[PDB]
Structure formats: structure tokens, C-alpha cells
């Protein structure tokens with residue numbers, strides 16, 4: 001909470017929050033899950049697969065806030081803020097997946113394919129630390 005976002009990282013915060021609900025629904029569709037009227041895992045139907053508005057707005061807001069907390073954790077571990085270029089921010093590419101893996105909504109099936117992006121071990125350990133901190137947050141939630 002003591003960490004405050006710089007305004008530029010803050011545009012990127014809301015924009016990547018939209019990117020995060022996109023990634024969440026895309027993980028949901030990568031799981032090969034089914035969409036239905038009722039929110040039951042046992043009968044294997046959930047209407048939380050298509051877009052953010054189809055979700056409960058409070059659930060989407062909590063998704064946004066946990067993405068915000070995840071990037072605040074990224075800041076807390078002390079990552080130096082870096083940006084490639086302004087074009088890579090104004091215009092992001094839209095990879096197309098086949099129709100089978102195409103989302104029912106109008107969003108791009110994924111931001112861009114994992115082949116061209118190789119993530120360095122410096123941030124690989126960074127993600128591990130994110131994993132421990134998220135596990136600790138869930139654990140204190142269970143303790144509460």
C-alpha cells in the first residue's frame with residue numbers, strides 16, 4: 001500500500017487490467033471448459049467464459065484489484081520501470097488462433113504468441129517470488 005504507482009505505469013495499470021481479464025478468460029478457454037446458465041463446477045458449466053461484463057462486476061473488479069496488487073508486488077520487489085517504445089504501447093499486435101480456440105467474444109484469441117518472447121531468468125525468479133507472495137496472501141486470507 002505504501003508503494004504508489006507512477007502515472008505512466010498507471011495508464012499501463014488499467015490497460016493491463018483489461019489485458020488481465022482477457023488473459024483470464026483465455027486461460028478459461030484453454031482449459032477446454034464449457035459455458036452454461038448456472039455457476040456450477042460439478043455439472044461443468046460456468047457463464048464466466050466470454051467477457052468481463054458477462055462476469056459479475058464485483059468479480060471483475062476483484063480480478064482488476066488482484067492484478068493491481070500483483071503489479072504492486074512487482075514494484076515492491078523493486079523492478080526498475082522500463083518501456084520498449086511508444087509504438088509497442090499504442091498498437092499491440094493481435095495473434096489469431098484457429099476457430100476452435102477462438103473466443104466467443106470479439107477479443108483476440110491471445111495477445112501474441114509465446115514463440116517470439118523468451119523471458120529472462122531474472123524475471124523468471126521474479127515470477128516465482130510473485131508465486132510465493134500470492135500463496136502467502138491466500139494463506140493469510142484462510143487464516144482470517
Ligand SMILES: Nc1ncnc2c1ncn2[C@@H]1O[C@H](COP(=O)(O)OP(=O)(O)OP(=O)(O)O)[C@@H](O)[C@H]1O
Nearest residue numbers: 048056057058059060061062063066138139141142
Ligand atoms: N474466480 C475468482 N477468482 C478470484 N476471486 C474471485 C473469483 N470469483 C470471485 N472472486 C472474489 O474473491 C472473493 C472470494 O472468492 P475467491 O475466489 O477468493 O474464493 P475461493 O476460490 O472459494 O477460495 P479462498 O476463499 O481460499 O480465496 C470475493 O471477494 C469474490 O468476489
